[PDB]
Amino acid sequence: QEVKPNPLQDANLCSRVFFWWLNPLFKIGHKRRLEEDDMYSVLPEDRSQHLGEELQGFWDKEVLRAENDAQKPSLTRAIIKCYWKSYLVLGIFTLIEESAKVIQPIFLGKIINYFENYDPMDSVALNTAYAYATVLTFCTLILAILHHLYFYHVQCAGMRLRVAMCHMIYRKALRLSNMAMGKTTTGQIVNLLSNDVNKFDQVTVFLHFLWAGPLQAIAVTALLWMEIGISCLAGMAVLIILLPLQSCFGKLFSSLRSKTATFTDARIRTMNEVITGIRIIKMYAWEKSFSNLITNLRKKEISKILRSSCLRGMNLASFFSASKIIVFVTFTTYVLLGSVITASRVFVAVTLYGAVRLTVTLFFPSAIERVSEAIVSIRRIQTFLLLDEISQRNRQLPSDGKKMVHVQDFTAFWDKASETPTLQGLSFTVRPGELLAVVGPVGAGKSSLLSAVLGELAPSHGLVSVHGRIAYVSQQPWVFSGTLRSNILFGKKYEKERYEKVIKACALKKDLQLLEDGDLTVIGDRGTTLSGGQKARVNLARAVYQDADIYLLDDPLSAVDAEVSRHLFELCICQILHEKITILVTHQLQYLKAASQILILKDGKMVQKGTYTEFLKSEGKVGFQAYKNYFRAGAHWIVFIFLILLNTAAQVAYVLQDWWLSYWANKQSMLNVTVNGGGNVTEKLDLNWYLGIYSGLTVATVLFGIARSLLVFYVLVNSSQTLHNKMFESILKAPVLFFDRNPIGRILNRFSKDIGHLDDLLPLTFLDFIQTLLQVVGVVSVAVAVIPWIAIPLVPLGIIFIFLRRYFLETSRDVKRLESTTRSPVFSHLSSSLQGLWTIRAYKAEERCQELFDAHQDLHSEAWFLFLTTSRWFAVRLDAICAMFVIIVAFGSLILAKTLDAGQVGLALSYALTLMGMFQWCVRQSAEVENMMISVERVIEYTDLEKEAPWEYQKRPPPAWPHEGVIIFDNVNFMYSPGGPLVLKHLTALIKSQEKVGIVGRTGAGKSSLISALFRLSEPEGKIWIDKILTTEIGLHDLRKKMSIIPQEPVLFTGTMRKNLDPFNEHTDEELWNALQEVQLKETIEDLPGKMDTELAESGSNFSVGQRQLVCLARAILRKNQILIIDEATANVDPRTDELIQKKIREKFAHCTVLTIAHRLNTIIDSDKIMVLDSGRLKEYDEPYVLLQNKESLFYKMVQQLGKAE
């Protein structure tokens, strides 16, 4: 559509400055939920194609110049040569803004200096002070409402660089060579596009500071000198000292993080090991072992996390109290040098120190870090872009409608570095319409035969006159993101008649029936809605629809059946490919005989070139409940009272440190009045008292900041630890139904991402938000204290802010969500192009895929533009509120000048000059915290999920409970869900003492239900007395312990073979030695390189499945129970191992009551008695002879059906 042309086009200068043109969007964003249709298209100069072309031109010129002067080309040179003009133009406003920030304290001092020499009858001084205040508010308006357009333009420059770089990367990837593709991997390129290019969105934000920081600071120092002389240096010294030390501590921080990561990873692995195999763990009564293992891992991880959090809290406290330390040092030096403090100089120095400290300790190091990251990103992208590309497709020879085709001395090597030739002898000619049947097992040389159409195995010199259009269908059929309209069309015009004829004769009605929409069905992500059959069929349909000349079919008949294959043979290969090239590799041996000519090769050796005659025969809101539950999990509410008291004390001391300077200045002014106007004796202010109180106030500020940071971090980390412990304990007791309903990925995500948030990000962000909110409250309270009437206009302004906040968030979140959902298509399209790059090059469809990628990137560019602009809109309005507050303070000081003195005016104005940045920081952090508390909500949701019966009761059965071996079923009705499906109907069974029996079901219908009922892990709704005791009165663990089972899929847990064989160490060592030697597995584990404590791989990946049944049988043998369950229903199980383990449990268990469930009837025929059971109804209970004789007996029914005999 002509979607709303970016109203930035028609917005005048005022509207662009205030982002007024964004107002309509918010309206709909408040009325309903934003979608992709309510979006704004990128500006014509921001289209991905345009930026890509311009940067391609610049980079090509740079490469040509580098070749001319014989040096390695530099991508940074090209980027600079491209964007330097538009960035140096933007630097003018950053110079203006730095100058404004520097010169604002000068006029603040002018106002205070007016207040110092107050004379109520001097009107000229009043007018001059009003002019100074007007200049001050002009400067603060420049800082507040004018900086945001410049910030948006800077971020646009970064986004332009990112988009151009992505276009470069895709254009290169589509032209990569085969061996270069082998050297790298698609994951590396997707990472290049995903995280390695996002750095350009950040560096540009602070790039100019690289020269603004060192310059502005110098200016500030000069100004500070002009105020307070050499004393200023002392303060500057502390600031300089603050740069290395903090950075140094940062290094230590990183180190600690690394350690925690390892522990976290280990813990997460076990989480997977627990969640993926939870059925087996609960089945084996092994919850205690994994519980204590995870407890140890979590304890170590939380110790490292506590250390890291203490370090980060110390850093935050230092950042908070650095201003106080700087001011205290500089003014102690000032007074001790023999000077006399005055309010004007004191607060000019305070404001200048605040500005320069914020710069030096926030912007400059961030600028350095982001520039270094961007430099390494540019290095990676450049070394990718110089990767050798596929030999450029040379212009085809005239090919005047001839069929001159001959391959001689075919040089085809997969690996050039390999001394062995990949292929040596390959020489054949293809005739129009004729079919050549290529055969090779598991891809034995089909790749060389197939690329022999000049795909990727081209000879270094010469050219083979292959004429026509190549239609290559790969082993892996591929569907790019879009609609079936796109894959069908693929650049070709919409051919109604031939589309219809192929769609009806080829019988694609399966898509119409299966797909809810038809041929317009929007392909889901990665084509999960479709299947490999559809992808293969659409590959053949694309090839036939584009009706190319050379048809390269890499076994497309494997996915389709023989009928559809012969159908396309007649319709396409016979009729449509009647005079077209039909290079068709085929297997399954039926199209080999269905074809006319066959070609088989083996390692550059042509097997045969004969026909069959050769006889080959081959989100929402988070309530107060969430915050309350998050906090009460940390510490007693007494501790929280102590914490808020400590926070209040820290902020009060922070403000009182500056108030003491103001009071000192006022007292010195009165003293000077007394010693000049009054008494002649120049009385000296007692330096000991004032300096001591000043030092005490700054020391108290430092100590209280440190203590508050440490306590907040400790209580929040302890809350996280308690929440994790509760959540894991609850999940370990969760019934199997919870794990069945919830996917493993969901639970693992809850245990990984949410816990990581609560451990790393949430405490830090919460502490920062509390700090900044308290600072804002301090500034507002100072202003209200100096001028009480400021309370009157503060009530409206704050109210407005609240409403504004809502009106922004209702849209902002939506935009954020949009920006998240429009970014994955780019990566998925890149992955799809890389996967099927062969056929993309085959069709010469590079430009079409480039356009598709450009559209995919343009959509995300719309999302990113909306995100940037809405953020700037909110920032403009917030800073306008702050500037209104500053104007109110500065002018109300002058209006109520009769009742104010220099110290109060200086203090209030100096704090108002920082309210702006503090408020912006605090609002954004508050939003960030409110967004992150969803992880806390999810964790708390898991902490109270429903649990099953307790493992152990206070009452216990005798330890020799399985003394008889009799278990019976008395009218048990298993119910997975109340009122749901019926799985057991009045199930009644009588199993004799010490009797080996099995049952058979119907493809799992009632098979696993019996095991679930016996083990009670899914709570059978049945009433049972095995050995005349109700199954309820034995606890979960006390029942499962004397409950031996062999699962269908044996599982292996990471750890020592000793721990996997016996995790509770309830069996003495020589017991395992002897038992495993009896099953001759001791020699097998002894030859393992690690011997007894062998480091098991990831769930025994190297261990064979036979060893898996072996180890499970060993577990059963050590368990030494009187019953045992054989759940032998796996299909792909090794027969040699099966005969083994059958003779094992026949000879080892012997006289132990076994319940055998299986699908192999032979494994039950050996059992003395068979109880046929299906659909909850006891079908057979009689003699085996009666079962053999009875025609209606289900056992005899299957006996007749499979055909086996005794």
Ligand X SMILES: C[C@@H]1CC[C@@]2(OC1)O[C@H]1C[C@H]3[C@@H]4CC=C5C[C@@H](OCCC(CO)CO)CC[C@]5(C)[C@H]4CC[C@]3(C)[C@H]1[C@@H]2C
Ligand Y SMILES: CCCCCCCCCCCCCCCC(=O)O
Residues 744-773 that bind ligand Y (CB under 6 A): 773
Query: Which residue lies nearer to ligand Y by CB, 865 or 919?
Result: 919
| Chosen from ligand X, ligand Y, none, partner binding at 895 (C-beta under 5 to 8 Å by type) | ligand X
Contact track, ligand X, 363-382, x by CB under 6 A:
-----x--xx--x-------
| Range 700-729, binding ligand X (CB under 6 A) | 700
- Least distance CB 805 / ligand Y (angstroms): 6
- Least distance CB 689 / ligand X (angstroms): 5
The answer to whether residues 34 and 28 touch, using CB atoms and an 8 Å cutoff, is yes
Query: Which residue lies nearer to ligand Y by CB, 924 or 1179?
Result: 924
Angle at CA of residue 650, ends 649 and 651, nearest 5° = 95
Query: Which residue lies nearer to ligand Y by CB, 216 or 871?
Result: 871
Residue nearest to ligand Y (CB): 926
Query: Which residue lies nearer to ligand X by CB, 781 or 931?
Result: 781
Longest alpha-carbon distance in the chain: 135
3-state secondary structure 921-964: HHHHHHHHHHHHHHHHHHHHHHHCCCCCCCCCCCCCCCCCCCCC
1001 is in an annotated binding site: yes
**Interface region with ligand X, contact rule CB under 6 A, candidates 70-78, 267-275, 335-343, 845-853:** 335-343
Query: Which residue lies nearer to ligand X by CB, 693 or 761?
Result: 693
- Least distance CB 889 / ligand X (angstroms): 8
- C-alpha 1097/C-alpha 1099 separation (Å) is 6
Angle at CA of residue 182, ends 178 and 187, nearest 5° = 115
| Chosen from ligand Y, ligand X, none, partner binding at 892 (C-beta under 5 to 8 Å by type) | ligand X
| Chosen from ligand X, ligand Y, none, partner binding at 655 (C-beta under 5 to 8 Å by type) | ligand X
Query: Which residue lies nearer to ligand Y by CB, 776 or 1170?
Result: 776
447 is in an annotated binding site: yes
3-state DSSP percent of the chain in helix, strand and coil, to 5: 65, 5, 30
**Interface region with ligand X, contact rule CB under 6 A, candidates 178-186, 801-809, 941-949, 988-996:** 801-809
The answer to whether residues 704 and 646 touch, using CB atoms and an 8 Å cutoff, is yes
| Range 11-40, binding ligand X (CB under 6 A) | 27, 30
Token pair of 373 as six digits: 């990251």
Long-range contacts from 963-967, C-beta under 8 angstroms, 24+ separation? 963/1027, 963/1122, 964/993, 964/1027, 965/993, 965/994, 965/995, 965/1122, 965/1123, 965/1152, 965/1153, 966/991, 966/992, 966/993, 966/1026, 966/1027, 967/991, 967/1014, 967/1024, 967/1026, 967/1027, 967/1123, 967/1153
* 892 interacts with ligand X by CB under 6 A: yes
The answer to whether residues 66 and 74 touch, using CB atoms and an 8 Å cutoff, is yes
| Range 1117-1176, binding ligand X (CB under 6 A) | none
Query: Which residue lies nearer to ligand X by CB, 41 or 140?
Result: 140
1006 is in an annotated binding site: yes
* 806 interacts with ligand Y by CB under 6 A: yes
Long-range contacts from 1143-1146, C-beta under 8 angstroms, 24+ separation? 1144/1079, 1144/1113, 1145/1113, 1145/1116
Query: Which residue lies nearer to ligand X by CB, 358 or 703?
Result: 703
* 891 interacts with ligand X by CB under 6 A: yes
Number of amino acids touching ligand X (CB under 6 A): 73
- C-alpha 78/C-alpha 70 separation (Å) is 16
| Chosen from ligand Y, ligand X, none, partner binding at 211 (C-beta under 5 to 8 Å by type) | ligand X
The answer to whether residues 585 and 424 touch, using CB atoms and an 8 Å cutoff, is no
| Chosen from ligand X, ligand Y, none, partner binding at 806 (C-beta under 5 to 8 Å by type) | ligand Y
For ligand X, which residue of 24, 491, 518, 788 counts as binding (CB under 6 A)? 788
* 792 interacts with ligand X by CB under 6 A: yes
The answer to whether residues 700 and 653 touch, using CB atoms and an 8 Å cutoff, is yes
- Which 3 state secondary structure label does DSSP give 144? helix
610 is in an annotated binding site: no
3-state secondary structure 428-487: CCCCCCCEEEEECHHHCCHHHHHHCCCCCCCCCCCCCCCCCCEEEECCCCCCCCCEHHHH
* 689 interacts with ligand X by CB under 6 A: yes
- Rounded (10°) angle between helices 846-895 and 762-786: 30
Which residues, listed in sequence order, are joined to residue 990 by a DSSP beta bridge? 968
Find, among 35, 41, 23, the residue nearest to 814 by Cα.
35
Query: Which residue lies nearer to ligand Y by CB, 442 or 802?
Result: 802
| Chosen from ligand X, ligand Y, none, partner binding at 372 (C-beta under 5 to 8 Å by type) | ligand X
Query: Which residue lies nearer to ligand X by CB, 353 or 480?
Result: 353
- Least distance CB 926 / ligand Y (angstroms): 4
Residue type at position 14: C
Query: Which residue lies nearer to ligand Y by CB, 867 or 921?
Result: 921
109 is in an annotated binding site: no
For ligand X, which residue of 781, 828, 1056, 1099 counts as binding (CB under 6 A)? 781
Count CB neighbours of 380 within 10 A: 17
* 778 interacts with ligand X by CB under 6 A: yes
| Chosen from ligand Y, ligand X, none, partner binding at 922 (C-beta under 5 to 8 Å by type) | ligand Y
Helices (H), 561-682: 562-568, 590-594, 624-632, 637-673
| Chosen from ligand Y, ligand X, none, partner binding at 776 (C-beta under 5 to 8 Å by type) | ligand Y
Query: Which residue lies nearer to ligand X by CB, 371 or 479?
Result: 371
Query: Which residue lies nearer to ligand Y by CB, 356 or 922?
Result: 922
| Range 622-651, binding ligand X (CB under 6 A) | 648
| Chosen from ligand X, ligand Y, none, partner binding at 773 (C-beta under 5 to 8 Å by type) | ligand Y
- Least distance CB 142 / ligand Y (angstroms): 24
- Least distance CB 660 / ligand X (angstroms): 6
Q: Parallel, antiparallel, or unpaired: how do β-strands 1123-1128 and 1045-1046 relate?
A: parallel
The answer to whether residues 1193 and 1178 touch, using CB atoms and an 8 Å cutoff, is no
| Range 900-929, binding ligand Y (CB under 6 A) | 922-923, 926
Which residues, listed in sequence order, are joined to residue 1153 by a DSSP beta bridge? 1123
556 is in an annotated binding site: no
Which residues, listed in sequence order, are joined to residue 1021 by a DSSP beta bridge? 973
Count CB neighbours of 46 within 10 A: 20
* In the block, residue with structure tokens 């009644």: 988
Query: Which residue lies nearer to ligand X by CB, 443 or 788?
Result: 788
- C-alpha 811/C-alpha 815 separation (Å) is 6
Number of amino acids touching ligand Y (CB under 6 A): 7
- Least distance CB 802 / ligand Y (angstroms): 6
For ligand X, which residue of 205, 693, 744, 975 counts as binding (CB under 6 A)? 693
- Least distance CB 122 / ligand X (angstroms): 11
The answer to whether residues 346 and 906 touch, using CB atoms and an 8 Å cutoff, is yes
- Least distance CB 653 / ligand X (angstroms): 7
- C-alpha 386/C-alpha 66 separation (Å) is 13
The answer to whether residues 423 and 448 touch, using CB atoms and an 8 Å cutoff, is yes
- Least distance CB 70 / ligand X (angstroms): 25
442 is in an annotated binding site: yes
| Range 200-259, binding ligand X (CB under 6 A) | 210-211, 214, 218, 221-222, 225, 230, 233-234, 237-238
425 is in an annotated binding site: no
219 is in an annotated binding site: no
For ligand X, which residue of 239, 341, 541, 787 counts as binding (CB under 6 A)? 787
- Which 3 state secondary structure label does DSSP give 990? strand
* In the block, residue with structure tokens 């797909």: 515
Binding residues: 440-447, 1001-1008
Binding residues for ATP: 440-447, 1001-1008
Provide the binding-site residues for ligand Y, judged by CB under 6 A.
Answer: 773, 776, 802, 806, 922-923, 926
